[PDB]
Symmetry: C2
Subunit: 481 residues, 2 copies
């Protein structure tokens, strides 16, 4: 008594398992044809294109951006693809308890030893805009309540604004600042800073009309500790030492941590400038961004204005934070014609709000025709899932890939070579994640509402940039009874 969705996937798994790990062939969709056209054009311009791509340097930057972004992170930074570790969600949020955010952060900081973290917002952000001008949005409204907290906490700055556009601009800027605060306040960044690890967190925004990054501030190292205001030196370390009953002694009245003060300063510097006309900072991030812009304007004086015209995306791409190729690029589409979600190991966990919010927004509101789950050969997140690391956020998130391994030993057992075996796990993970998006209330509602929505599974190796078909599902009822 399996549902049609269940049957469909058993069929897709057989189709996958009949091809060897890493050798799946491209499929039917025009995305494979477009991906091919791209590969050809790339090889034609530079025959070393993929060799260089497959052999780039580790990323030194973690970039937390928005899903509706018309410019790839590496591009804005004038850096090679893959040199920037990317996380994307609705309105570039850095919610305190969001594990999708926390796991990408911990992976970037502890696994990758990333040196700089950038939170980037963009003017005109559909997420920020929905928070102010739309209601009764369902699931995603719960995600957007965090942006509402930003408007709430900063009413003084917002009410000051002269018009709707100036107010949206300012909310977007304040949103970035608030997320920067959140990144610095995580246990991950606090621990790193306590251990003297070199790690900066900086905010940035830009308008697609010029692609110019404006500065929201950089924090180098600021303790967010306030226990010094409530615990006597003797009672200090109480809870960790098993004593949760040690008294709270008000050492000082209204103490604020170093982080609080740091943010107070950055806020002051943001607010004193005109909304939407912030200055660029002097850090290399801005100078590199500037060289990039000039280079673009050279080859095309309207480059950015066109970028600012691109039509609503018809595809949602869910990929891995490793990202050695921008989604729009791999399928030969203009920057901004694809809505993107990226996390560690391209997971589509059933109950993951970051994933569900992007899905709903794309499927229900933007009405995209396709949802593509894209994995990649040699994925470090997947490789990390098989290791022995005990990191509280990243390693509990990765336990989901372990379930995939465990439930697919029949096929995995046949492969003993480590490389191929990882690559097979990576393929089945894509298949399993596709199943999950197909099973969401979101896709099921769209389907039985008669909405055209294709869920495509894809995988590729950076050495060739060729997309390999993991399966496609046009419609499949998931009802059992």
């Amino acid at each position: 008594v399996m549902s049609d969705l269940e049957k469909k996937f058993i069929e897709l798994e057989a189709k996958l398992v009949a091809q060897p790990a890493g050798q799946a062939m491209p499929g039917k969709s025009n995305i494979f044809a477009n991906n091919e056209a791209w590969r050809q054009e790339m090889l034609k311009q530079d025959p070393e294109f993929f060799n260089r791509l497959a052999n780039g340097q580790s990323p030194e930057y973690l970039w937390i951006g928005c899903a509706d972004s018309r410019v790839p992170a590496n591009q804005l930074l004038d850096l090679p693809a893959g040199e920037v570790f990317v996380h994307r969600n609705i309105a570039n949020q850095c919610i305190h308890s969001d594990i999708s955010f926390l796991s990408v952060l911990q992976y970037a900081v502890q696994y990758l030893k990333v040196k700089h973290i950038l939170v980037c917002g963009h003017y005109g952000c559909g997420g920020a805009k929905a928070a102010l001008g739309d209601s009764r949005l369902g699931l995603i409204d719960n995600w957007l309540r965090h942006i509402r907290d930003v408007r709430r906490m900063n009413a003084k700055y917002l009410d000051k604004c002269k018009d709707g556009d100036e107010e949206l601009n300012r909310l977007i800027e304040l949103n970035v600042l608030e997320q920067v605060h959140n990144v610095c306040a995580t246990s991950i960044v606090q621990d790193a800073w306590d251990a003297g690890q070199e790690l900066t967190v900086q905010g940035v925004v830009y308008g697609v009309g010029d692609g110019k990054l404006r500065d929201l501030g950089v924090v180098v190292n600021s303790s967010d500790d306030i226990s010094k205001f409530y615990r006597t030196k003797s009672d200090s370390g109480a809870l960790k030492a098993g004593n949760p009953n040690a008294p709270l002694v008000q050492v000082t009245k209204g103490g604020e941590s170093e982080l609080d003060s740091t943010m107070e300063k950055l806020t002051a510097e943001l607010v004193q400038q005109t909304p939407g006309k912030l200055k660029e900072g002097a850090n290399r991030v801005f100078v590199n961004n500037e060289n990039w812009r000039q280079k673009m304007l050279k080859q095309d004086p309207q480059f950015f204005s066109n970028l600012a015209h691109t039509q609503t995306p018809e595809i949602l791409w869910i990929g891995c934070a490793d990202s050695r190729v921008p989604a729009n690029q791999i399928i030969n589409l203009p920057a901004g014609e694809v809505f993107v979600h990226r996390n560690i190991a391209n997971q589509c966990i059933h109950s993951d709000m970051s994933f569900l919010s992007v899905l709903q927004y794309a499927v229900q509101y933007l009405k995209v025709k396709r949802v593509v789950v894209c994995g990649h050969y040699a994925c470090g997140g997947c490789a990390a899932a098989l290791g022995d690391s005990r990191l509280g956020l990243i390693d509990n998130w990765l336990r989901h890939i372990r379930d995939v391994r465990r439930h697919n030993q029949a096929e995995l057992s046949r492969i003993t070579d480590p490389k191929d075996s990882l690559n097979r796990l990576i393929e089945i993970n894509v298949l399993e994640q596709m199943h999950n998006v197909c099973a969401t209330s979101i896709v099921q509602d769209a389907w039985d509402a008669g909405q055209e929505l294709e869920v495509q599974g894809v995988v590729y190796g950076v050495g060739d940039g060729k997309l390999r078909d993991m399966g496609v599902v046009a419609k499949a009822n998931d009802d059992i009874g």
Copy 2:
């Protein structure tokens, strides 16, 4: 190449599957002996004890409380067990994007048609206390950052406080008020209110020294809408109608929604009272709580003072929000000797922060010796998981139970009777959830740190209140390579 944990569970599954659905026998632990002693004493006092329990009325209250609570919700409300749908987490949080919270809320509101929602905090809350006086706590500090936002937003009220205790009292009260705000602001409560559904949200606190509920305010129906301040009537409904590009027009400068005003009023009423000495309201909740208290004092004048002395809990109990029996009761222990986490269908999702935060706090900080995952026969959450409902929060959360069904068809296929079939799924769900807690970085660290930690699986039918063994694991390495 399975890990020891994996082998261990294959062994536990065989042991379970050899007993018919609903007939598993009690196990070895003293908890089964204690549960039995309890059943006997109950039957001896009233032979209709379980018959009444098994046939109680559906809950009209949703109660969101804290995991370190020394008093069962139904007790404080002077109501029969099961008459209150309970959710418990660290510091009774109602985080905007917390799916564990959102799925219990939606189930209570849409499935159960609950009429009143109560957010209850308690003085001396270890979660609130840790937020002020302890740092470098790891995973859980990310959960606790939300309480820090409460201190941040309410600095004016807090700095006013004369001492540490008064300041903790006031933070706890403000925390409850902030969570009430969050409950009202959810898409779930906003939708219900828009549909004219009768649904109140009220805040309450109490100190275990008297068990007296104090009022934090009740909100009956307040729109949290602000799109009216930014969207012209024509542009209204833009995003839902597929147009995310409709302009944002600042209709009015600093508009606040009905909810904002409502909360401003409640805050004013809380703040003007002495921290820790709030008044009780006049609603039946308070009058019933009062009758309950007097009844307790009658049979025991020190009832509450003793309650306030109970030692740190030695067990973490993870149960279902249905809860027809308090955890401490079922295993014959004093109110407050068991740390409790409750969600829909007693889920222990790998990446669930609400679950992970309670786990870490109990295992790492309180150092509990046992973690018990308790499921129950005829569980409505599990039954709901097999239905066709498309609710954005509750139904995506339940997809996890669907995975259990799908991966255990070998055993499930043998059963055709709906009742037994559900009951078997419920059993395997407990086993699968135990596996998940065993596989967390938290339990693995404790184990290879040589810390005594037993993970017990248990299930029962309310018709007899007898705990049935689903398995126990004392230690099992989960490393593959």
